[PDB]
Symmetry: C2
Subunit: 353 residues, 2 copies
């Protein structure tokens, strides 16, 4: 397998994810990955109007989401949505592949929030908003009110930071499916299922369950030192590839702080900083992208169980772009198994078992 | 890429074994439920075990109201594999796998319910009828034919459906089994692994070969016409679907079995074209290219003689291969080792951000 999409701090087709998150809206980054370049003002203006037109859900899909139980795993909602949308607006040929990628990016916010608000608040919601960005549109659908400019900014920053990350289990699942020449909806449905597993997804959710235990930074440091001596895994720390830092941590940390200031938080961000300082002093371990993402989402009023669903809204851009590469250059390992079972044996009839 | 005890393909002696038993002995002497039990539970079941397994599967054939109402909203011209994908995704929200302790109960539910998910959608959209998802047939093979045709199937038709489901049940590592194990390696739920596997099997480099064989053999009104047209397709270097294999050297053990049963079905229904056309293409492929037919080739005629629409062929393979897929997921859960090779970077070197104005 070859890729021109990203490499390890972290670049997207040569561009530092830090520069992108500072100076770009998510749509500029989705365009870069799916279409090959940062878009000029004409292309960006056309792109934005195309996506603003792809936000509403078909009536049949609304009626399906209404039958998924309130207590369902939200990732099964995202899986089921992608699967049903594939039967209503099919990818008849690979010529439609960029149009379908765009449709998923524009619709996923409505699939999540139409289900959530129907089952939790008993409202059937309008799936269009007045926000021109996906990041704003999401917050408009989730809370049914105009978001603050700060909260629209932090949503755009998060979608950019998580958009693409080389190869991992979900991106690999998308490529294996792609390699049989299956449709784009299959490759996304499979990638969502792999992300559902707790060894791959749920990290920012687990970071949130850790920081929410502690009523002060004193109590947090005191309890962390006990966990570290007990050799407990600490969620949000360490990486398989980076060694000095995760470029994405740099960025989200500073936005989480501005949100703490905005909402007059006294506990949650202070607790996060105490854990971050302690991990460096005791283990020289830097925090990864998931750690400060949890406080930031919480400060914008997002239910913990929607964190990994928001990652799907972002990483759909990387996944689809990987499928386009696999279709154009269909190279991948073909797996064999080591047989460890029994030797060949005679058939035994029912009466002798 | 992993380790398995479920099956060996292309090795000396029996060409295909399931936990050491020859697939040709299983297809001759067993019902599918005996082979599903062997894969999921580890041994061939004894009489008391089989009796209780059949009773358990018999009570897991009906679909929840909410699932029926979802399938009513999938369009008539949808890909039937997208219907199987959607059905598994919805059933996982309604009857969740809360613990890996439930894993064999969820695999059993999928084997028992898949036939109703396929036929409830198909007959609602194609006939405007809401069907009963229960039947009086004791086996999955018979149950599928009772739901599809809405009447009692013949003994011969029930036996061939049982043979087909055994022949297609397991095949070591391949794209769909590998997809299920990658999903299993993240400790995702069993419904995720199956939904992922169906997606990979939808791709035409993996699924659909016995649908392609049907579209070839249905073109000819005489065996002599089939022979003359095949000689021209070979001149054009067209790929003939259902012939040769990437692993088997001399023959596919599943071919000799389904060919015999397709012949018996041809005699029963009074066919004098479709089996003769199939044999002519087989004989011509041997003489011209020494390529043997694989499992896909005689499956096309066998399914057609039992009145099955071509676009339901790969969905029947899903009903069968769910046994192999789920047994593979349990192995991955018990022994979580896999390789997922990283990619090589071939993209551009690092470059400065260009603000919007200068693009």
């Amino acid at each position: 397998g070859q890729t021109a999409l990203s490499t390890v701090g972290l670049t997207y087709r040569g561009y530092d994810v830090r520069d992108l998150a500072a100076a770009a809206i998510f749509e500029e980054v989705a365009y870069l990955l799916l279409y090959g370049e940062l878009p000029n003002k004409q292309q960006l203006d056309a792109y934005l109007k195309k996506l603003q037109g792809q936000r509403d859900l078909p009536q049949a899909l609304k009626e399906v989401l209404e039958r998924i139980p309130k207590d369902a795993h939200p990732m099964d909602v995202m899986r089921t949505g992608a699967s049903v949308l594939g039967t209503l607006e099919p990818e008849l040929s690979f010529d439609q592949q960029r149009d379908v990628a765009d449709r998923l990016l524009a619709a996923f916010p409505a699939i999540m929030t139409y289900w959530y608000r129907f089952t939790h608040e008993g409202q059937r919601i309008d799936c269009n908003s007045d926000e021109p960005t996906i990041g704003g549109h999401f917050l408009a659908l989730l809370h049914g009110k105009k978001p603050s400019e700060l909260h629209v900014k932090v949503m755009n920053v998060s979608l950019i930071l998580y958009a693409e990350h080389e190869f991992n289990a979900s991106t690999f699942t998308a490529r294996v499916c792609a390699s049989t020449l299956s449709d784009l909806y299959s490759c996304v449905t499979g990638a969502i299922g792999s992300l559902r597993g707790p060894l791959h997804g749920g990290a920012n959710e687990a970071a949130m369950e850790l920081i929410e235990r502690f009523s002060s930074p004193q109590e947090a440091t005191a309890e962390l030192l006990k966990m570290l001596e007990r050799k407990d895994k600490i969620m949000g720390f360490g990486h398989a590839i980076y060694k000095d830092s995760d470029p994405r941590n740099e960025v989200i940390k500073g936005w989480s702080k501005q949100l703490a200031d905005e909402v007059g938080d006294k506990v949650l961000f202070a607790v996060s900083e105490a854990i971050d300082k302690t991990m460096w002093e005791q283990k020289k371990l830097f925090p990864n992208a998931d750690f400060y993402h949890a406080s930031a989402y919480h400060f914008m009023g997002i239910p913990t169980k929607l964190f990994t669903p928001i990652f799907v809204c972002s990483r759909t851009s990387g996944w689809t772009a990987h499928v386009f590469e696999q279709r154009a250059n269909n190279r991948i390992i073909r797996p064999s198994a080591e047989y460890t079972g029994v030797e060949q044996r005679a058939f035994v009839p029912l009466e002798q078992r």
